[PDB]
Ligand binder design. Structure first.
Ligand SMILES: [K+]
Ligand SMILES: [K+]
Ligand SMILES: [K+]
Ligand SMILES: [K+]
Ligand SMILES: [K+]
Ligand SMILES: [K+]
Ligand SMILES: [K+]
Ligand SMILES: [Mg+2]
Ligand SMILES: [Mg+2]
Ligand SMILES: [Mg+2]
Ligand SMILES: [Mg+2]
Ligand SMILES: [Mg+2]
Ligand SMILES: [Mg+2]
Ligand SMILES: [Mg+2]
Ligand SMILES: [Mg+2]
Ligand SMILES: [Mg+2]
Ligand SMILES: [Mg+2]
Ligand SMILES: [Mg+2]
Ligand SMILES: [Mg+2]
Ligand SMILES: [Mg+2]
Ligand SMILES: [Mg+2]
Ligand SMILES: [Mg+2]
Ligand SMILES: [Mg+2]
Ligand SMILES: [Mg+2]
Ligand SMILES: [Mg+2]
Ligand SMILES: [Mg+2]
Ligand SMILES: [Mg+2]
Ligand SMILES: [Mg+2]
Ligand SMILES: [Mg+2]
Ligand SMILES: [Mg+2]
Ligand SMILES: [Mg+2]
Ligand SMILES: [Mg+2]
Ligand SMILES: [Mg+2]
Ligand SMILES: [Mg+2]
Ligand SMILES: [Mg+2]
Ligand SMILES: [Mg+2]
Ligand SMILES: [Mg+2]
Ligand SMILES: [Mg+2]
Ligand SMILES: [Mg+2]
Ligand SMILES: [Mg+2]
Ligand SMILES: [Mg+2]
Lengths: 151, 117, 203, 122, 50
RNA sequence: AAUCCCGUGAACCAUCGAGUCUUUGAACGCAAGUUGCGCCCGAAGCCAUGGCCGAGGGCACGUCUGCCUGGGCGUCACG
RNA sequence: GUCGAUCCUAAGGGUCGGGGGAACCCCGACAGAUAGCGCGUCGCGCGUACUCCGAAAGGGAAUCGGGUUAAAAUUCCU
RNA sequence: GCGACCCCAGGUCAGGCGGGAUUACCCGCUGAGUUUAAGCAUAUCAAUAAGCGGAGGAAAAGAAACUUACAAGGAUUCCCCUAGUAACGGCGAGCGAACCGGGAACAGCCCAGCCUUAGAAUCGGGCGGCUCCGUCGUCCGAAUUGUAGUCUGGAGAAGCGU
């Protein structure tokens, strides 16, 4: 197992990489990545415990006779729909999606739809934001008005 | 760092079985108890001469009984101590045990209690 | 909806992007054994249109099969018979490589049920398929009305009776009418029916 | 006189073991009599004592099994010996609920458009 | 031979037990047709084959 | 055979739902022209936490789900 | 317990993994995270893919007289 | 060094699944020659016997990428007929279906993909309760590289009102 994964890394860089696959090596800079990830942490989806805790605050509210949340959108199927509908303002793509065919076309779609996109390192890092083991890509449909300048 | 060029599988933790249910509901009954081990004494003329000549009792025993279990069966059954046990499998497929009692016990006296003499 | 992009990309197998990815994967598969469990399908879009679902009970295996025809397995290439039967090479197996891959996985994985399979790669010597198998004993499968049909005893070893998608192809069942009529209900059933000498009581 | 099974079932566990011990000892004496030229009447008692031993063992095993089945009643996992035997194929079958599972659209068809009762006028 | 396995010795013991005449009272049963033991074996005439 | 007869009841009776079911065999600790060669758990009993004794049971392979313990710069992030 | 089997390995046999094979089967430690062992008291050290079968003439822990049965003994008795 | 993920390894870890047997019928593969041709090699015997696998009370097939050319039929299977016919064949020996028509039976359907994003609404396992082939609560997992719903061309989505 160790030998195969090391030969796999070598073989990739020995062969000529077509441009559509070579664009994923040009990931977002480390300095800007931290700023982007810091903002994402401010729009994390609610946890399982947090999700249950609000659904009981509503059941009691319903018995005793409200604002749209602003959170990160995840899921390749859902993100692609947002991009096509032109409701996405920023697409974050993981550079290490295997198989790569799942996202090798995303940069072209974002470019054609005039939606800014970035390629960041770590699908596991993206998954941690949305409380998942991994995430192929993230999307921001709208940020809170209090921080629309830095965004 | 590694000082060995040969890779060895690292030691990993192993747990003991803790089944949520027992595979068998209860233990099986003992199929080789004292009565099962000792089927009956041998009352042949050759066997009888060994009662007094050698202080030995000749028994027909279960073929699956070993000398250790025969010794314990005789102790529980007749409450006597054994000097040594010799066993053989007869041509008819049954097992015969030559049981020699210690000098503290008399085979002839025990034989009368059994009811063969 | 991202699966259409993936599916259309896999229709361009001779493009530079696919030729590179397939070249690297083909090398990787050669180094591993002929039957290997894979953590997830290499073609999720292709898998789910053949019945795969991302839920417990569904498993995917990659199967490697050797390419080429079927040399007649006779000692020294000697045939004792008339010239029409003396051929040894240029003979073709009636089942396809896809069927063989399913049978190899099915026999090895006796505790699972073969659902379907699909092509993933090939070289001059080997052909690679992914076989979708179902753990019929898992509760998630048995409680799913769309797949729990495969838990019934009539669906034991579908691949070994030619009942998979690849099985229907090589039996001649993919099609009907004047070009495929002898294949139903089965080729041998048709022969026996047509050979039957019907001797009625009043004849 | 002889052993009555319905009387054994009223005895305690210790009593059955004690009686079983006596029966086995009695049978051992009969075996000795069989090889020492015992009287024909005493050789007929071997069959009776053998029946008694089997009856006592049967009652002991039945009580033991019955108690065990009560201990594991309402438990999810039972020892294999206490699980229903039936046949291999029957045990692997889908449950009654699982066999009747259907998709949502199939459920709606049964409700919206079930088979109707009707007749043709003569 | 003197050197023999346990399994073989057990089989030979059973064959010896089966090599006996039928009990006399068998021929006096009601509706009896057993005249004698039709499977008698002599060590010198027919061999056991094992 | 004071086994059994106005009856918790005879039977080489019928029937089946309780219960028993040796060694093997797909045969599963390893083997086998061997009742051969291993390891683990352990009621009861018994000698002063330990020791002996021991009924009975366990230890094949492939595989699914979950889990525990790990390996590799395989891809990263932070010191 | 003392004679043998049992133990050891020989020519060879049967196999894991891997490679073949529609499959029955073929090759047989050759495509591989070996088996574990040792010393402390669970930890350290070592660690080259079979703890398998294969000899009643090969290798190999230990029994000798005297006596005893209608029939057994370097096995029973002393 | 500490973490996340990926791939892989070990486990007598918790709970499951698989092997073998049977031959009348059924499904897949493999596959002869005797024989016939008055010889014989294509052919025929035969898409058969033998061989290797896999099921069930039936199996297989099955809701048209069909038949047909008509004033059109309408999943599959089976019987009669088509028919010893069209066709195939050292056009020799021989071989040989199908549609229409008449009957037996009759049944239709489920997914994949654009479409929850104001909420993975889905499922498994551990534990507990209950009215226990299931259901409810709770906890831990699976899953966004997509569970459940909606849709399947006969349609359908959306809007409108009967
Ligand atoms: K031939
Ligand atoms: K020919
Ligand atoms: K041995
Ligand atoms: K030797
Ligand atoms: K020598
Ligand atoms: K001596
Ligand atoms: K639950
Ligand atoms: Mg001996
Ligand atoms: Mg999984
Ligand atoms: Mg002779
Ligand atoms: Mg013979
Ligand atoms: Mg065995
Ligand atoms: Mg044995
Ligand atoms: Mg010796
Ligand atoms: Mg050798
Ligand atoms: Mg072999
Ligand atoms: Mg192998
Ligand atoms: Mg080597
Ligand atoms: Mg190694
Ligand atoms: Mg050895
Ligand atoms: Mg040996
Ligand atoms: Mg020697
Ligand atoms: Mg002699
Ligand atoms: Mg376990
Ligand atoms: Mg001729
Ligand atoms: Mg002729
Ligand atoms: Mg000729
Ligand atoms: Mg045949
Ligand atoms: Mg079978
Ligand atoms: Mg059956
Ligand atoms: Mg029928
Ligand atoms: Mg069917
Ligand atoms: Mg249709
Ligand atoms: Mg029709
Ligand atoms: Mg005509
Ligand atoms: Mg023909
Ligand atoms: Mg027809
Ligand atoms: Mg018709
Ligand atoms: Mg969906
Ligand atoms: Mg609708
Ligand atoms: Mg509509």
């Amino acid at each position: 197992n160790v030998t195969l994964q090391r030969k796999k890394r070598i073989l990739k860089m020995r062969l000529k990489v077509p441009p559509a696959l070579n664009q994923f090596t040009k990931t977002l800079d480390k300095n800007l990545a931290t700023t982007l990830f810091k903002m994402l942490l401010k729009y994390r989806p609610e946890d399982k415990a947090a999700k249950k805790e609000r659904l009981v605050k509503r059941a009691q509210a319903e018995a005793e006779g409200t604002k749209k949340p602003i959170i990160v959108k995840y899921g390749l199927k859902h993100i692609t729909y947002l991009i096509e509908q032109n409701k996405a303002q920023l697409v974050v793509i993981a550079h290490d999606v295997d198989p790569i065919e799942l996202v090798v076309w995303l940069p072209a779609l974002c470019r054609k739809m005039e939606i800014p996109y970035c390629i960041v390192k770590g699908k596991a890092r993206l998954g941690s934001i949305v409380h998942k083991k991994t995430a192929s890509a993230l999307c921001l449909t709208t940020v809170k008005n209090e921080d629309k300048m830095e965004f | 760092i590694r000082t060995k060029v040969t890779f060895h599988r690292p030691k990993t933790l192993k747990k003991d079985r803790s089944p949520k249910y027992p595979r068998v509901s209860a233990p099986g009954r003992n199929r080789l108890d004292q009565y099962a081990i000792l089927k009956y004494p041998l009352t042949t003329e050759s066997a009888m001469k060994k009662i007094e000549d050698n202080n030995t009792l000749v028994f027909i025993v279960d073929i699956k009984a070993d000398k250790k279990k025969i010794k314990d069966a005789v102790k529980k059954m007749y409450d006597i101590q054994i000097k040594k046990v010799n066993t053989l499998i007869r041509p008819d497929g049954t097992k015969k045990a030559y049981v020699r009692l210690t000098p503290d016990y008399d085979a002839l006296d025990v034989a009368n209690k059994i009811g063969i003499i | 909806g991202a699966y259409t992009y993936v599916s259309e990309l896999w229709r361009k197998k001779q493009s530079d992007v696919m030729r590179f990815l397939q070249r690297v994967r083909c090398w990787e598969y050669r180094q591993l054994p002929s039957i290997v469990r894979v953590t997830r399908p290499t073609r999720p879009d292709k898998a789910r249109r053949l019945g795969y679902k991302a839920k417990q009970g569904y498993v995917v295996y990659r199967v490697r099969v050797k390419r080429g025809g079927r040399k007649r397995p006779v000692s020294k290439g000697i045939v004792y018979g008339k010239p029409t039967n003396q051929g040894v090479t240029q003979l073709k197996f009636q089942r396809s490589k896809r069927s063989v891959a399913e049978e190899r996985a099915g026999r090895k994985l006796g505790g699972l049920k073969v659902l379907n399979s699909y092509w993933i790669n090939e070289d001059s010597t080997y052909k690679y398929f992914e076989v979708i198998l179902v753990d019929q004993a898992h509760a998630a499968i048995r409680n799913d009305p769309r797949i729990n049909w495969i838990c019934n005893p009539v669906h034991k070893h579908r691949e070994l009776r030619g009942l998979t998608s690849a099985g229907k192809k090589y039996r001649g069942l993919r099609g009907r009418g004047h070009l495929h009529h002898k294949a139903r209900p089965s080729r041998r059933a048709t022969w026996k029916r047509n050979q039957t000498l019907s001797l009625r009581r009043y004849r | 006189a002889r052993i009555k099974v319905h009387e054994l079932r009223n005895k305690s566990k210790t009593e059955l073991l004690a009686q079983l011990k006596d029966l086995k000892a009695e049978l051992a004496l009969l075996r000795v009599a069989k090889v020492t030229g015992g009287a024909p009447n005493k050789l007929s008692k071997i069959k009776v004592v053998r029946l008694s031993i089997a009856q006592v063992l049967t009652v002991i095993s039945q009580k033991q099994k019955a108690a065990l089945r009560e201990v594991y009643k309402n438990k999810k996992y039972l020892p294999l010996d206490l699980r229903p035997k039936k046949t291999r194929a029957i045990r692997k079958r889908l449950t009654k609920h699982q066999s009747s599972l259907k998709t949502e659209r199939e459920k709606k068809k049964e409700m919206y458009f079930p088979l109707r009762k009707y007749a043709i006028k003569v | 031979p003197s050197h023999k396995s346990f399994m073989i010795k057990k089989k030979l013991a059973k064959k010896q037990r089966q090599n006996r005449p039928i009990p006399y009272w068998i021929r006096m049963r009601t509706d009896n047709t057993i005249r004698y033991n039709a499977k008698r074996r002599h060590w010198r005439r027919t061999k056991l084959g094992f």
